[PDB]
Design a protein around this ligand. Structure first.
Ligand SMILES: [Ca+2]
Ligand SMILES: [Ca+2]
Ligand SMILES: [Fe+3]
Ligand SMILES: [Fe+3]
Ligand SMILES: [Fe+3]
Ligand SMILES: [Fe+3]
Lengths: 166, 510, 388, 388, 510
């Protein structure tokens, strides 16, 4: 099976996901899945064609497990890992505002998304963070956006220039 | 005791005061700019009066369609190539109209002045209207036209092809993903002002020339709503002018917005006009220089110079590449005809003369190639030939720009032939220009869009088409075709026989 | 000239024959129903479903999506153009919702358009017939100009609460319903102002400036908790479903209904006010129209979702409890308004009874749908503590 | 087929070619304004006038006609199709009239169609928002079902009085206005029944039959003198103008405006009834609409005729006197209805307040236009003699 | 608390009880019948619902007209002959629609049953709509057409010619002057059922054949309201079927009605279609037999048999005079062209062939005459020739039926040639048929209509035209013309130079 919307990889993960029935286990796997398969800093590009869909499936399980495990207050204010959502938000924002350059900034924003994206962090706190983090990141990035020559920007990013054509 | 009442402007007089102050009365979206608290809107409307002026327009519009136009059998008496073009034109526009809804809701959230908010609000409702209008155009051509397939399921069959990916960049993601202002520049300042407003109009011209009276009826009505949006866009700039950040960022965001849109429309609109029509209206080349250079990149853009706005620094390159872009693209569009949801056609003899006349050198390059493909039997199902094969034989790989999603064949193109390939964290990326490259190098996490080769890798052609429902109601005939005639239409099996299997061209690089 | 310069393909003999010649002998496909692949909510596919469902290019990773792959361009940081992360709710398909009224743009602006003109005629008949002669001056100058006038800010606030949802909604059908629910609120706020400006025209000295009503809203007591709840619903909620749910299935179903129906609409008569009831009837129709969509979306599609039914009800139960308190507080502050009425206007029994009417309808129409355990006596008494 | 066997000259290449050949190089006359010879009432000629003025084929012998000669076929006996002999009134031109609202068929049904749709919505929300709850059983089941219901016959009768005028009107402008005045009246009667019908759907034992109110109208004593006035205005007047005049500028300006506004409109609130008021609302607007036309025809046009000013006024002051009595008699009898209201519902000071309002407006909008000196006190006094 | 409302059918159920009995609750019009007071109408409508179904129709209609049709320049791309024809067709139908208002008002007054009164009332409103719709057709062609004169002032210019007199007999006086029931028959049972309804649709046919998409858009909409009127007329017969007087008078008025309506439409209609168009649709003889014989006189009338309705005893006589009726009339119409408000065109080679093919013997009579007239220069102003002169030369007197007002020429006609002349109390009277003769002998006071010869007697042609504004804007060129070309238009002086004076042809018997 190698389909676009239905294939073996997705099926295998669906089965893996059904065998999660503890919030702590399911949450840890979602955070791990994200470090392993999302953003351009993913540990591997092996699931590039199915990670998006698979991740949603894993999220679905972490959400259902969190709603049954948490009381109403914790659901509105704690991360799936038991941290105080607001403390995480403020702390991360604090780190962002103290970032020296746009390179430190991107690591802080992307790192935040891989670790706290819902159902880990309640969406209210998460989107509020998206709002603040994104702002600084753009402020640092869009400053003098064309002053660095492509030759150098490639070095700064750290790509392996494989081929060019003038 | 004389008959009196209240109109829209009398209530609008106090609209601005509706918003009040409180700690968290602030935008929910990230942004480098601060939209001024006292910004004002141009049109003094309220919900009730807005509804009345649109309801009136609808009457005329639907009245025409349901009555006179239907009796005249206008849904049929349209040139085949144009019936197919509207499948793309209308559905693709539909998505731009749709995302503009979410786009203007994001601007309404950004705006702090009740009047600026209200200005965007009107557009929010206009875009819903526009979404439903474009939907109707396809709904109408499906129920009454010479070929409903494509018109009746574009919303799912458009996902098969590569031109769809690029449309989502400029008309979907480009409108809603980014700094609220960057989105406004993509959608309004550049989008509507430079391309769409002039485009909606031009389409009714080309439409009229090819026997289509259905599209002018609807689009001309869509066109009456653009004044407010042009205004909204203009005001976005005004609302951020007296802000320090505007000086450090505005021009950078405008430049990126300009290149983003231009990258897709320059080649695609020109392609739809000249290759998707029988009767030509005007050579795309001059249409462009008038729109982009004169009207927009001079007149409209210069009127905004008083606010620190400058001419796009990439305008020169855009111009340099423009000339052959659409011709280079139709070659790829036709070669990959089995991936569309529309039927294509080779330029006929009369068209080749027009292309050569208006584009000296057209024949020596594209002309001869199209002539070799028909010789190879590209129009014939039994030939067992698809232009794609010619590309493999002559070693002309086709890549997908990781940023704009626009397909390009650098070894065969007469226009831009640049190609940049990079490796980063175990992934390969292909770029066709220097502007798109900076965008990625600087904003990697924003452009992780997987292309058709990556998604379809290892899959046999007919299997991809089948999975994604690229068939007609007979369940065997392809929606897409390499000719617009009514006989000898290819079937899934004619493709299965070719046994073509997708492979990622970037993999060849060590 | 008389025939013009541009030659059209449908009427130009030469061009028309070229076109007619290229035409196939018959349609290349006999399936002429656009949207034929969409699962009908009713007997047959409707023009509303045909023109609306799937306009949103969601990939399959957003429940119900038909497309595939990541967005082409995302926000700095990586946030997707649209994604599961913008709301706590989960479903099997974000495209399941159907506005029971099947409203797409054309029908929506057409009814509002009708109402606009009917409103215009109504006022002209009202002033010409000199019906203003019957309205009590104090009810007109204090309660309508100041208190009903302040409520326009409440409705404006509820309107703005919809902004994020217009941008974040995960489907076309929800986006349209959401957009129409919001537009209806800004319309009501505007009708409140439309009435004041009308009075300013037919009543000497009547000031239409919003300074008074607005001063009431931002600094008075009657609407203090009301404004706090509204400010919260609008700017402290980043989840588009919590916002639409809490506003319509909690705050406005309780506070709004009480203020509009149990206070103003119920007392206007006793003061010869036949003007305000007119606009309140619109707001009430609007409330009724929106409710049907709200119920379908949150109870029929999400509350009864085959896979997340239990999860979603827990979340909406959570939201009801989170917002029921501020709403009770809003009602409680509003009780201070009765003490301002001329003596003998109404009594504690009538007030209590109307409170039970609003609370009982809410339990039946909303609370029960998600098994939220609401104690009607507890709610009402918590509110009555506000009666001075 | 897909193309259709029938060929059309606009799109058929061959036929169109022939047509294009026969066309002139330009219009054969630059005057492209239909009705360019009509004397505008306003700045520029209106669509309303162009499409209406002179449609009636009258010859010059019928004041204002443009045709010549006699009719081609007349009545057995010699009676002309339309002759100056069908009305006492005289004028320089029967086409001088102009409906201030400039309603030709399209606008007319448009505005009314909107009201019909609005009416449907309103009624729906009214029941969905359970506003019926607040209404008083006695008022509902008694004053509305029986006395408001019986008023539908009053309205139906005024409608029927228009029949002959629809045949004898001497100009297109007066015919369209007359048709529309009458058509609104039948509308009112139907709306009265529409309510009795609505209630019968939301209230268990309510009977929508016309049995009760019809009996009240044909036998009761409250409308007895009204019913007689109606039977006279309808079947005893053969002069189309006397009919329209006496019906709109006398009988309905008094009795009608009182029963509708001063009684049912005024009291409805005091019984928790905001339903009937919605319909009496449409009725009052319709009254205002006709009034503007009635004023233009009988005052601006006839009563102010450059050659028959003095003459017509005399004739109208005559009809006013002729019918001002039967009207009063209709009102007096109606006063006896108050004695049926629950004690305290309303004192005598109020009915007198309303009685003077009605009479005062009827002197400001009608009697003082032909100079019919009337005593507001004497008139009210006479009506008042009808209470307990 | 479930959302509820009430509909038209639910309020109409109690509509019959609306009327109450009393003293003088009787019709104010003379009649020999007694319409049953328990009579029902077929459609359960209340004012507000009627308003809605009509408003919806207007939307489609006016939208098509203001939007698409205007954009296609529909008011222009129509054949000249047809443009002139619609001046008559539209405005003449207009008066019929108009008098129909008074007609149904008089019938509404006649009915005693509330339901029957209600049905008539709906027609009263429909008729008002049709008056306005027909007015709109002329209004539209005036504003956007190739020749506004006539279209723009037909309400006054129509008074110059003799064809108008005949129109008033069947669409004005015949609809309102007389026994309420006799009028009904003229209007509904015969007019609408046998001629108008079929013709309304036929018009759209001939209209579309000649490039007119305007008329179809409006007339087809009118057509949709006809079913009600068919019902009213039908219920009228029912209402009186029982009354003994019915079996003693019905058939008489019905015969007189039929003869009255066919006496005009038979000639005029066929003439308007065959001579006022370039492209033909169907020979009028065939169309006539199907309508007047099968459809009406057969099907329709048959269903009214169980109510004592017998086929018109004048039916046979009608089919006899019919065949050449319209051809005979156009000769007269063209010869008297200066008295119209429209431009006429003589048959071209194709049409003459079409005419000969469909009417064997046509050329040898009509054809040769038109060629003589043309060769003599009836189309050229400088020839000084007007066909009326040819009638005098060859002594072919033209008379006007004192009853039907229809023009006839006994010594020339290929159809009926009978002519009866009488003198009474000092007045001469001319009849063209036995039925009309009876009507006059029996009811002298009903027919005292001065004909064009009596009224214009002694006047010089150009003077009659000038006094009645038969001129175009320039005040010199005549609204009427003997050809439909753009050049060489006849002026008032070209007419005065001929110095023709009117004469009462009956005096030749003195
Ligand atoms: Ca490698
Ligand atoms: Ca307080
Ligand atoms: Fe748009
Ligand atoms: Fe736009
Ligand atoms: Fe008619
Ligand atoms: Fe009719």
């Amino acid at each position: 099976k190698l389909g676009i919307h239905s294939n073996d990889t997705r099926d295998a993960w669906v089965n893996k996901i059904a065998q999660l029935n503890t919030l702590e286990k399911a949450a840890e796997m979602l955070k791990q899945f994200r470090m392993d398969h999302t953003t351009p800093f993913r540990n591997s590009y092996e699931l590039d064609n199915d990670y998006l869909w698979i991740e949603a499936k894993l999220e679905e399980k972490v959400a259902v497990l969190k709603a049954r495990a948490f009381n109403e207050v914790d659901f509105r204010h704690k991360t799936a890992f038991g941290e105080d959502a607001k403390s995480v938000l403020d702390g991360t924002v604090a780190k962002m505002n103290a970032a020296k350059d746009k390179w430190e900034a991107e690591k802080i924003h992307i790192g935040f998304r891989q670790a706290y994206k819902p159902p880990i962090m309640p969406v209210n706190y998460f989107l509020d963070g998206e709002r603040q983090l994104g702002t600084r990141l753009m402020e640092l990035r869009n400053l003098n956006y064309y002053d660095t020559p492509l030759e150098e920007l490639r070095k700064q990013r750290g790509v392996r220039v494989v081929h060019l054509q003038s | 005791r004389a008959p009196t009442s209240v109109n829209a402007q009398e209530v609008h007089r106090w609209l601005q005061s509706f918003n009040w102050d409180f700690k968290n009365n602030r935008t929910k979206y990230a942004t480098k700019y601060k939209m001024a608290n006292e910004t004002k809107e141009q049109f003094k409307l309220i919900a009730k009066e807005y509804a009345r002026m649109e309801a009136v327009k609808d009457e005329r519009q639907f009245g025409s369609l349901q009555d006179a136009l239907t009796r005249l059998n206008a849904g049929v008496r349209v040139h085949p190539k144009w019936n197919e073009t509207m499948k793309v034109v209308s559905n693709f526009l539909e998505v731009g109209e749709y995302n503009a809804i979410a786009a203007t809701g994001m601007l309404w959230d950004s705006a702090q002045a009740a009047e600026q908010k209200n200005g965007y609000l009107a557009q929010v409702l206009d875009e819903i209207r526009h979404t439903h209008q474009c939907a109707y155009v396809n709904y109408y051509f499906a129920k009454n036209g010479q070929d409903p397939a494509g018109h009746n399921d574009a919303r799912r069959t458009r996902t098969i092809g590569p031109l769809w990916k690029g449309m989502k960049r400029v008309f979907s993601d480009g409108f809603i993903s980014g700094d609220a202002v960057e989105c406004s520049l993509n959608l309004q300042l550049v989008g509507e002002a430079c391309f769409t407003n002039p485009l909606i109009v031009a389409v009714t011209e080309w439409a009229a020339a090819n026997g289509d009276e259905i599209t002018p009826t609807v689009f001309l009505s869509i066109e009456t709503d653009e004044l407010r949006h042009m205004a909204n866009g203009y005001q976005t700039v005004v609302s951020i002018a007296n802000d320090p950040a505007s000086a450090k960022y505005l021009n950078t965001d405008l430049n990126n917005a300009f290149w983003t849109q231009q990258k897709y429309f320059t080649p695609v609109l020109g392609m739809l006009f000249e290759y998707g029509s029988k009767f030509k209206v005007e050579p795309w080349v001059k249409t462009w220089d008038r729109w982009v250079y004169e009207d927009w990149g001079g007149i409209w853009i210069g009127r905004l110079g008083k606010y620190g706005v400058e001419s796009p620094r990439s305008l020169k390159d855009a111009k340099q590449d423009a000339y052959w872009a659409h011709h280079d693209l139709y070659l790829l569009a036709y070669a990959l005809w089995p991936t569309g949801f529309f039927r294509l056609a080779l330029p006929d003899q009369e068209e080749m003369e027009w292309f050569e006349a208006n584009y000296p050198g057209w024949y020596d390059h594209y002309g001869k190639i199209y002539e070799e493909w028909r010789a190879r039997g590209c129009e014939d199902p039994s030939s067992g030939f698809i232009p794609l094969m010619w590309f493999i034989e002559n070693n002309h790989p086709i890549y997908i720009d990781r940023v704009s999603q626009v397909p390009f064949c650098p070894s065969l193109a007469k226009g831009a032939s640049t190609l940049r390939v990079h490796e980063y964290n175990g992934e390969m990326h292909t770029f066709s220009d220097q502007w798109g490259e900076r965008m990625w190098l600087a904003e990697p996490e924003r452009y992780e869009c997987q292309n058709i080769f990556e998604q379809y890798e290892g899959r046999e052609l007919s299997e991809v088409i089948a999975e994604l429902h690229g068939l007609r109601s007979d369940g065997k005939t392809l929606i897409a075709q390499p000719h617009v005639r009514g006989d000898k239409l290819w079937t899934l099996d004619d493709i299965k026989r070719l046994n073509c299997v997708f492979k990622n061209p970037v993999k060849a690089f060590n | 000239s008389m025939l013009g310069e541009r030659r059209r393909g449908l009427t130009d003999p030469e061009m028309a024959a070229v076109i007619l010649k290229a035409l196939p002998e018959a349609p290349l496909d006999g399936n002429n129903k656009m949207g034929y692949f969409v699962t009908p909510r009713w007997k047959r596919l409707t023009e509303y479903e045909a023109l609306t469902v799937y306009a949103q290019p969601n990939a399959d990773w957003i429940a119900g999506g038909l497309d595939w792959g990541d967005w082409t361009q995302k926000f700095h940081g990586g946030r997707p153009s649209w994604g599961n992360e913008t709301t706590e709710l989960r479903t099997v398909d974000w495209f399941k919702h159907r506005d029971p009224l099947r409203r797409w743009h054309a029908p929506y602006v057409k009814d509002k358009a009708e109402e606009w003109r009917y409103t215009d005629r109504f006022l002209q008949g009202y002033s010409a017939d000199g019906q203003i002669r019957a309205m009590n001056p104090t009810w007109r100058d204090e309660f309508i100009n100041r208190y009903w006038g302040a409520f326009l800010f409440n409705e404006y606030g509820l309107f703005n609460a919809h902004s994020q949802g217009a941008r974040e909604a995960l489907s076309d059908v929800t986006r349209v319903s959401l957009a129409f629910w919001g537009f209806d609120k800004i319309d009501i706020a505007q009708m409140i102002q439309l009435e004041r400006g009308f009075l300013a025209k037919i009543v000497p000295g009547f000031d239409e400036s919003t300074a008074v009503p607005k001063a009431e809203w931002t600094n008075g007591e009657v609407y203090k908790s009301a404004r706090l709840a509204v400010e919260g619903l609008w700017q402290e909620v980043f989840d588009w479903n919590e916002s639409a749910f809490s506003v319509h299935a909690v705050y406005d179903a309780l506070f709004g209904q009480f203020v509009r129906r149990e206070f103003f609409q119920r007392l206007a008569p006793r003061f010869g006010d036949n003007l305000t009831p007119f606009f309140i009837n619109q707001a009430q129709t609007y409330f009724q129209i929106a409710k049907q969509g709200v119920q379908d979306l949150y109870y029929n599609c999400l509350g009864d979702d085959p896979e997340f039914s239990d999860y979603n009800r827990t979340v909406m139960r959570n939201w009801t409890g989170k917002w029921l308190e501020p709403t009770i507080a809003a009602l409680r502050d509003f009780m201070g308004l009765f003490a301002k009425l001329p003596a003998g206007t109404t009594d504690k029994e009538e007030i209590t009874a109307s409170l039970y009417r609003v609370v009982d309808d809410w339990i039946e129409d909303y609370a029960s749908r998600i098994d939220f355990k609401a104690d009607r006596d507890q709610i009402v008494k918590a509110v009555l503590a506000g009666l001075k």
